[PDB]
Structure formats: structure tokens, C-alpha cells
């Protein structure tokens, strides 16, 4: 007769949602992402390959991206608290122009105002340079941008904005499954799955239209979306070859310190030593047509073979979603992308210069819960960044059902889609080590 | 691609019977009730799921690419225009 036996430690897992912890790298100083309380990672990762198993992955429902979206807000908004808040900066300004020869004449403003001295019975008349996007006219006689919906605090000068790679490691009893299948879209089974202790280096890069410094594909350009039919879903594109972009800010700025209280300083912007120039970005025009020529080849798999695929620029919204925004060198850029997405693809040494704009008063993450904004201090010197373009975030226009014409426009805004492109191949499971099986053994009495 | 067909163009059946209107479409499909000069009102969504606030005399079911709207126990205030709604494609519905 057969008898039931109890086995402990069987390789059986189930889907579950747990709280993964961080894991940084070795320290050879400070930043807004608290990469000092994380546990140090192992010098070599242990990736055990799993054979004869077809695990079903599911994008757009993973809890790992929903947890990383909360962890970034809980670190970006908790670093603006301890250092100085610029609540007396909402005084009335007297702004004059800087550029003499008009053509942009009106980008920079030379504003002077009355600031509080460290002795609170006298006042000083100081001056500073502000951009046009940070000032509004009251009825000259300007003020800051909002001064009515937000309490402007200064971004903290000792911490940095550099996105360093972090890892997300599972606790005891849980495991992370990595899908290594090349021809694998968002939703579907994965017959090539292995386990890891935790993931690769995920850099928390904040961008809207172009995914900068991301993970590339293996063989061809992959196009992932929740549903191609629903036009309200942003189409995520992942490149297989990198597109190098060179962004710069050639204005040699100087930083002056203004004491606005006892032990509280405010970093204004002094004179600009040199020429007044405009920040811009450069991409290779030969590489951009080669990269866009592969996306139009992969887009025709979900649509007709002889359809006309167009690329238009953004339709509107606030400045964050209609322009390519990033954090090159600590300063926030807003680049006009009307030169990239301007093409029409009929079936069958030069560089593109993208004019950008600089902003200093930034409101992110819906005001950090209540109303709070951020004032980035000016970075002294010339700034230049070299990064990769490893994917786009498109949005198809609806209503097109005849004429075989589909137009794709860049979108963004939802910061979760920046981490959908990184955490799409991972899934957390929960080990259930109890199992029963019939055996011809017996308990010795 | 989305394909639409609406064969019951017009029907004027009496009260008390059981009438059904059909439309063939792929994807999600919602049903709406629209009076003359008034705003449309959602009756059922996803083919068969019922919306809170709609009376229980409305029911629907699907089989492949055929959605049906069952109308039993008609009322004097239940004579309006009904059309099925894919995302951005709305066919001109029929009146009772």
C-alpha cells in the first residue's frame, strides 16, 4: 500500500508581493537617493539557470515598479527638509534685460530686490540673475514664478543629483526570476528563465520623452505596450544600438553667496564671465535616421504592411511633457524636440541641434504631497553631458481607421514608464517548501 | 483595426416582448442609452458586466464576435436610442 510522506524544501514557488530592500555598491559622497543605508552587494552575482521550466511573466501588473515609484518620491522629498528654505524670496523684483543686441533677447533677467540681513532690523539691496521661466509680471516689477501655490525651498547644495545604480534584493523565502528570452514582449510566457539574488544596475534617471542611460535590447528593436488598440496607452520602445547625445550649457556662470539669516545662505547667480549663449543638444543625423528606420520596420508588425507611419512633435501640456527634460550636471534642461520627430515614412557629419531652456524652480511629484517646490542652485562653470538614447515613449493618435496613416507623437509625464523599461524582465515569487507525495515507506513504530 | 456592423437599423416592436439588437466588433464594447437631446447613459460595459444604478431588466452576453443586448419587460420610459461603443468608434444606433 502507498503512504504519504512529508518533504521539506521542494522547489515550488507562488506569486506574491513583498517589500524588496536596496543594495548599493562599494564606497571608494551624498545624494538625494540614500545610498548609504543600503546593504553592500556581493562582488559576484549568483545566477542559477533554471531548465525545463516555462514561467509566465506579466508586465504592467508588477509590484516592483509600483514600489520603486514610491521609493524615489520618499527620497526626493525627504532631502529638501533639513537645509534652508527660501520663504523670504517672494519679494517684488526689479528686473532689467541683459542682452543689448536684440535678435534670445529676454531669456535672462537682471533682478534686484531687498533681502533680509542676518540682523533682522536692516535690509540689503542685492541683485541676481533669473531666467524668464522663473519670473512673471505682476501688473519691470516682476516676482518669482508662482509665489502663491508653493513654498519654495532651496535644493540642498552638499547632496548630488547623480543617478548611481541601485539594486533591489529579495528577503529570505522569496526569489526573483529573470526572463532571458529575446523575442519576448511585455505579457506572455518565458521559456528561458533563470533566478538571481537580485537585479542588475538600475539607474533612477528622470526623463520624459527619451529614455537616457537605460538597458538596451539584444537582437532587434523591441516595441512593448499594454495594448496597441487602446490609444491611451504609451508605447514603449527599446533600442538595440545606442544613440549618443551631447548636451551642454556654454554659459560660464558664477555663484555668489547671500546671507539671508543666521546661518542660512542663498546661492544667487552673479555675473556671467564670457559670451551669452544658449544651451543646446546634438544628435547624429545619420544615426537618427538609421535608428528611426528600424522602429518603423518593427511598428509595421502590429499594423498593416503598406501603411504610412508619420512622426509629429508634441501636441501640448505643461513644459515637462512637451519638451525633453533631464538633469544634466545638476541643472534642469527643457529641450525642444521638433527636429527629431519630424518625418514621414512611405512604405517601400551633420548634427541636429536641439534648442533647450534652463529652469531653476522645479515642482515634481505633485508638490511632494502638500505644496513643496524646489529651487536648484546655479552650478559654477560650463556643464557638458554625454549620454545614450536607449528608447522613446510614443503615443499614437486615435480616430485613424482609413487612408492607412498612423502618426506617433512623443509623450511621458508618468514617471513609472521610465522604470517599466528596466523592471520588465523581473518577477518576485514566494517559496512554498512544504509538499506531500505517496511513497512505499512506513513509520517505524 | 476595428470593424463595425449594425444590422438592426430600425425596429418598432410593441411593449412586453423580448427584443435583441446585435453588433459585431472586436475588442471591448460598451452599451449606451441616449434620449432625444439628452446626454447618453452607460447601461452595461465589457459586454456583460452591469453598471450600478441600471435596473435588472437589462442583460447582455457575448459569443465570439457577436454582442447581444436583451430587452425584456419593456417600459413606457424605456424607448430611446441604443448603440455599442468601441473606444473611438461609435455607430449611429437605432430607435425603438
Amino acid at each position: 500500500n502507498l503512504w504519504v510522506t512529508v518533504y521539506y524544501g521542494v522547489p515550488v514557488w507562488k506569486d506574491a508581493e513583498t517589500t524588496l530592500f536596496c543594495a548599493s555598491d562599494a564606497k571608494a559622497k551624498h545624494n538625494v537617493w540614500a545610498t548609504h543605508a543600503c546593504v553592500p552587494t556581493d562582488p559576484n552575482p549568483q545566477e542559477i539557470h533554471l531548465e525545463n521550466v516555462t514561467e509566465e511573466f506579466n508586465m504592467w501588473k508588477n509590484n516592483m515598479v509600483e514600489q520603486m515609484h514610491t521609493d524615489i518620491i520618499s527620497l526626493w522629498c525627504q532631502s529638501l527638509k533639513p537645509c534652508v528654505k527660501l520663504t523670504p524670496l517672494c519679494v517684488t523684483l526689479q528686473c532689467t534685460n541683459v542682452t543689448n543686441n536684440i535678435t534670445m533677447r529676454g531669456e535672462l533677467k537682471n533682478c534686484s530686490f531687498n533681502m533680509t540681513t542676518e540682523l533682522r532690523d536692516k535690509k540689503q539691496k542685492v541683485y541676481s540673475l533669473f531666467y524668464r521661466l522663473d519670473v512673471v509680471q505682476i501688473n519691470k516689477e516682476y516676482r518669482l514664478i508662482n509665489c502663491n501655490t508653493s513654498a519654495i525651498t532651496q535644493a540642498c547644495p552638499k547632496v548630488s543629483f547623480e543617478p548611481i545604480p541601485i539594486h533591489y534584493c529579495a528577503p529570505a523565502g522569496f526569489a526573483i526570476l529573470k526572463c532571458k528570452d529575446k523575442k519576448f514582449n511585455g505579457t506572455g510566457p518565458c521559456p528561458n528563465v533563470s533566478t538571481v539574488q537580485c537585479t542588475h544596475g538600475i539607474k533612477p534617471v528622470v526623463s520624459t520623452q527619451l529614455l537616457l542611460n537605460g538597458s538596451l535590447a539584444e537582437e532587434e528593436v523591441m516595441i512593448r505596450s499594454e495594448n496597441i488598440t487602446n490609444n491611451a496607452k504609451n508605447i514603449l520602445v527599446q533600442f538595440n544600438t545606442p544613440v549618443q547625445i551631447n548636451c551642454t550649457r556654454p554659459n560660464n556662470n558664477t555663484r555668489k553667496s547671500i546671507r539671508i539669516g543666521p546661518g542660512q545662505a542663498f546661492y544667487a547667480t552673479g555675473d556671467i564671465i564670457g559670451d551669452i549663449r544658449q544651451a543646446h543638444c546634438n544628435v547624429s543625423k545619420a544615426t537618427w535616421n538609421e535608428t528611426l528606420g528600424k522602429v518603423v520596420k518593427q511598428l509595421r508588425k502590429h499594423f498593416g504592411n503598406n501603411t504610412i507611419i508619420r512622426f509629429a512633435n508634441s501636441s501640448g501640456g505643461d513644459l515637462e511633457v512637451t519638451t525633453h527634460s533631464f538633469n544634466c550636471g545638476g541643472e534642469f534642461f527643457y529641450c525642444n524636440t521638433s527636429g527629431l520627430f519630424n518625418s514621414t515614412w512611405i512604405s517601400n557629419n551633420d548634427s541636429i541641434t536641439l534648442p533647450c531652456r534652463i529652469k531653476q524652480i522645479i515642482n515634481m511629484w505633485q508638490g511632494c504631497g502638500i505644496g513643496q517646490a524646489m529651487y536648484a542652485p546655479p552650478i559654477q562653470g560650463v556643464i557638458r553631458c554625454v549620454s545614450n538614447i536607449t528608447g522613446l515613449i510614443l503615443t499614437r493618435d486615435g480616430g485613424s481607421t482609413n487612408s492607412t496613416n498612423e502618426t506617433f507623437r512623443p509623450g511621458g509625464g508618468d514617471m513609472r514608464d521610465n522604470w517599466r523599461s528596466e523592471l520588465y524582465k523581473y518577477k518576485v515569487v514566494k517559496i512554498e517548501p512544504l509538499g506531500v507525495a505517496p511513497t512505499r515507506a512506513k513509520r517505524r513504530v | 483595426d476595428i470593424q463595425m456592423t449594425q444590422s438592426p437599423s430600425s425596429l418598432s416592436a410593441s411593449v412586453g416582448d423580448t427584443v435583441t439588437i446585435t453588433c459585431q466588433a472586436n475588442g471591448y464594447l460598451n452599451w449606451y442609452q441616449q434620449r432625444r437631446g439628452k446626454a447618453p447613459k452607460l447601461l452595461i460595459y465589457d459586454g456583460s458586466k452591469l453598471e450600478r444604478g441600471v435596473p435588472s431588466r437589462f442583460s447582455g452576453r457575448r459569443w465570439g464576435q457577436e454582442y447581444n443586448l436583451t430587452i425584456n419587460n419593456l417600459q413606457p420610459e424605456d424607448i430611446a436610442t441604443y448603440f455599442c461603443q468601441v473606444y473611438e468608434f461609435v455607430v449611429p444606433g437605432t430607435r425603438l
Partner: nanobody
Amino acid sequence: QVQLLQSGAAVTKPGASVRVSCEASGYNIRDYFIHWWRQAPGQGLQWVGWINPKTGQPNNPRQFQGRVSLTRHASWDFDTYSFYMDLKALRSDDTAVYFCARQRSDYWDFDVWGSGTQVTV
């Protein structure tokens, strides 16, 4: 409590610009899209486009690009909104009534609508 207020009717000339308002009050606005619909007298509905209330990015078909500009406005306390719809150059066949829908889920459930604003040229 969930209501979408509608603005009054307006009569203009061919070549002017109109504006139709829509105020959402009694729900969480930032988590649900707001669409716009239009029906001609004697015909069925026609899609105008949606607008993301969180970001502001609009969407419009090929037959409406360059004319309609969807714009939203939020208050200081973010409890009520003001969704606008400005037409650039009205034609002769634009005499219709405009609605203000609200997408609930991924099945595009427009449970709550507007009262309707009929404009003529």
C-alpha cells in the same frame, strides 16, 4: 456627488473662436481621463479627443489637428478642475452639441457625462 458641470450655449460667426467649459468637482480628477464628444443633429456621436488631467497632453484625430486645443486648469487646492475646448476656425458644418465624458477604466466606461453645449455658426 460626482458631477461634471457644463457651460452655456454660444452663437458665433464662421471664422470666430469658441470655448466650452467643463468642471469636475466630486471625485479624484487626476486618476481619470476626460474625453470630449460631439454629435451633429441627425447623426451619431463623433470623437473629439481626450486630455490627461495629470500632465495636460491632448490627443486629436487627423480631421481635428490644428483647430481644437484641449486645455485644463486646476485650482490651488486641487479639488475642482476646469476643462476647456477652444476651436480655432469653425466651419459651416460645426453646428453641433459638445459633451464632456469621463473614462473610468481600461474598458472606456463613460459613466458620467455633461449637460451638453450646442453651438452654431
